């Protein structure tokens, strides 16, 4: 059920910002020059 007691840090934990996360996989990186220069100049 719902736990009435919750362990928590002072510096890492904030009550407002809640975040939860976990052939070859590779993140998609755009090789376009105008895309990277368009991202860095905006």
């Amino acid at each position: 059920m719902k736990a009435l007691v919750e362990e928590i840090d002072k510096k890492t934990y904030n009550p407002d910002i809640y975040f939860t996360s976990l052939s070859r996989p590779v993140k998609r990186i755009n090789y376009s020059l105008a895309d990277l220069e368009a991202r860095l100049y905006t």
């Binding site: 736990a3 009435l4 007691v5 002072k10 407002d16």
Partner: protein
Amino acid sequence: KETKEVYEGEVTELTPEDKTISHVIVGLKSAKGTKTLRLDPTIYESIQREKVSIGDVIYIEANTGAVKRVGRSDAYATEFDLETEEYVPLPKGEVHKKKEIVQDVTLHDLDVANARPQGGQDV
């Protein structure tokens, strides 16, 4: 057979988080460790019932929510010469403790537990 969690330590800060709906982070200072924990407003209401302050040894059960105060810690014994609050030493061991019980309980006791409310510390 069931396992329960045991928390104990000296109360350092009673303060809201940073913004709020009024919950309280209770920083329990044990001997072998220091940890901060966030509690429900009902167990915080029983904490307000026990009249604890900064530097008081408490006993808090996780699954049940019952609160028992042991007394003022031995570090504040020299603050006043005479005090009605007894001075207990700091609890040895960790902050979080676990144990298992082979407690027997009759089925009729579970029927009365399923029938009518028995007690609690809230209104």
